[PDB]
Amino acid sequence: QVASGRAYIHASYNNTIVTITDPDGNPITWSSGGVIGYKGSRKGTPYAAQLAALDAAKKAMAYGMQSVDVIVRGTGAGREQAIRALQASGLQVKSIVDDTPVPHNGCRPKKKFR
């Protein structure tokens, strides 16, 4: 049972995924737009991110989680809304960092992205 921990926000154009970890970074609980009754592109919406981040923090609070650092990956419609929703969670949000991965000109992208 951990009070301090982490929130990882995976925000794509298709969906928003929140996974809350221990301080070591091991998942405690997670949630997504799909974990709420959303399928299709409705998963992508900011409302969905919100509903997901809530349910994630909520579930985390049952393991006695209070403080989290928030780590953000991707450019989503739900990116900001998730950040908001964790702050309104009752969780402490001890920090916010953008870890979104970017190539130093790496692998060739799928034709869509060129």
Partner: protein, 155 residues
């Protein structure tokens, strides 16, 4: 309404309760211009609204109107390849208009033989939260809500 804003007419208050909301209602009861008809119905109903459930027919009426006005509704936009039902708040203007309309409409579908009775009863129930009108409200409102996530496409 391309050009400016479209004036909302005010309305002569009525010669029984001196209240605009009643005439609008009587206007909505009206059919083919026969206003005298549209009047007696409302008032006859008002007889009945006192007769059974002794109370203040004004009060009952004005209550069941607030019990009808929809706070949130869907209005659907085309975005890309699909038509999204979209959540939006109703103006007080539109709520009145939707209040009165469903009221009557649901009234006239009641099984009561005499029109004023239908008007009587529908109003009495809506005051209490029961009826065709009220449903239509709650209905419209659950159809908003569930679309909460289309609230960003909002004008």
């Amino acid at each position: 309404a391309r050009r400016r804003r479209a004036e909302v007419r005010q309305l002569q208050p009525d010669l029984v309760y001196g209240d605009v909301l009643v005439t609008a209602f009587i206007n909505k009861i009206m059919r083919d211009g026969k206003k005298n008809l549209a009047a007696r119905i409302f008032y006859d109903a008002c007889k009945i609204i006192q007769e059974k459930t002794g109370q203040e027919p004004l009060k009952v009426f004005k209550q069941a109107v607030e019990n009808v006005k929809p706070r949130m509704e869907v209005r659907s936009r085309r975005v890309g390849g699909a038509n999204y039902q979209v959540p939006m708040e109703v103006s007080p203007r539109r709520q009145q208009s939707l209040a009165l309309r469903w009221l009557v409409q649901a009234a006239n579908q009641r099984p009561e033989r005499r029109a004023a009775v239908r008007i009587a009863h529908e109003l009495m129930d809506a005051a209490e939260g029961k009826g065709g009108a009220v449903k239509k409200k709650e209905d419209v409102e659950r159809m908003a809500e569930a679309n909460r996530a289309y609230a960003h496409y909002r004008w």
